[PDB]
Amino acid sequence: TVVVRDGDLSSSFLAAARQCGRVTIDTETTGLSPKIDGLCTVQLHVPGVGTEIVRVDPTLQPTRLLQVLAAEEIVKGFHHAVFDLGFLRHTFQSKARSVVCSKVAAKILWPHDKDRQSLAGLAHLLLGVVLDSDWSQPELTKTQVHYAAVDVEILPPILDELDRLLSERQLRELAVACWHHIPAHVELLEHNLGDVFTY
Amino acid sequence: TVVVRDGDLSSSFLAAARQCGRVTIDTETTGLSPKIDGLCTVQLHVPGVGTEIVRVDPTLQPTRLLQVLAAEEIVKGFHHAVFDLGFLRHTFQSKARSVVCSKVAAKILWPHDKDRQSLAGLAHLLLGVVLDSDWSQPELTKTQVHYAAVDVEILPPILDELDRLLSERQLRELAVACWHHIPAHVELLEHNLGDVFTY
């Protein structure tokens, strides 16, 4: 159900992503600064199919992964899209389209509850699920591999639930607009442009 | 060339805006807080035609003005769109489409020069033009009327010039994306939702 891939998403998962129309994605990194630290792996999950851990190769562009990220017809769900896309933007010059983010959604629904805005907070509140280091190792251990996959496999039902809550509060159109802005926000951070919406 | 209108944009200026496809807009207010202070007037300029000062009437929705603001086919140019649209959003529940802003553009081009991001800074730098109180008075004076119109009439060439500069630096697509976000940002401020793009 989980396969570690070197350099790129597999052709089989590219086709599966295209058939699904929806995937979930996150990353493992050497630190918390998208423009400085290293991108080690990208996790991609296709609901009903499984998960790939893509090990980044500095000498190889992950062509099929970048196609998925750029595809308007495939929705990419994240639990911290600005963070992950910042790494993908800085590392591969990747400009994504059709991204959604559970953190953005949770910030619209519960702006004052930081703990609810994390994926562990959301999985606990909504699903009753309690979510439990050297990602550049020559070999990923079974413990590393199982952990690396947990977040992308729990994200689809969380996103489905947040969509319903947003819709019931008449805030889904605002979330859709905010999700649409994420790639431009990532671009603003890449260029050190700051908050262009103040006065 | 300038006409003070009570309650709403005139039918003649609605037609002229539709023919032009582009207008410039700003406001006069009782203070600097869009969700607290009063919206006194809305200025609208149609290039080549003239300017209307719309005096806001609390008992009258400015129907034609709101149609212009909502029209996808009419670009509305501002020199501080988030500020002005915040007033229009709070006062009339107006949700604009196809807005552009010289301040957003200047913040992308010159992020570190606050003086260049104001309309007076832009008019001076680009055009060599040097831009020179009770907006709720029973009557607007000729001095008030001429001042209220200056900013919207100088904005069209400034926006044209900023577009060229953005395009030459390959930053126009980013500005277009940021301008597209302005109404959603205004919505976020209306709901006290803050920065939904942090982590």
Author numbering:
A (entry chain A), B (entry chain A): 10 to 141, 147 to 213
Original authors' sentences:
To understand the molecular basis for the specificity of dimeric NrnC homologs toward DNA substrates, we determined a set of crystal structures of diDNases: (i) a complex of diDNaseNoc with dpGG to 1.55 Å and (ii) diDNase from Rhodococcus (diDNaseRho) in its apo state (1.72 Å resolution) and in complex with dpGG (2 Å resolution). However, no electron density was observed for pGG, confirming the low affinity of the protein for RNA substrates. The biologically relevant assembly in all crystal structures was determined to be a dimer using the ePISA server, which was consistent with the oligomeric state of the proteins in solution. A comparison of structures of apo- and dpGG-bound diDNaseRho revealed no major conformational changes in the protein upon substrate binding (RMSD value of 0.45 Å for 1604 main-chain atoms of a diDNase dimer). However, two minor differences were observed. First, region 142KTPRLS147 appeared disordered in the apo structure of diDNaseRho, but became visible and folded into a small helix when the substrate was present, owing to the direct interactions of the region with dpGG. Second, three side chains coordinating the substrate, H88, H89, and Y213, adopt different rotamer conformations and turn toward the substrate in diDNaseRho-dpGG.
Dinucleases of the DEDD superfamily, such as oligoribonuclease, Rexo2 and nanoRNase C, catalyze the essential final step of RNA degradation, the conversion of di- to mononucleotides. The active sites of these enzymes are optimized for substrates that are two nucleotides long, and do not discriminate between RNA and DNA. Here, we identified a novel DEDD subfamily, members of which function as dedicated deoxydinucleases (diDNases) that specifically hydrolyze single-stranded DNA dinucleotides in a sequence-independent manner.
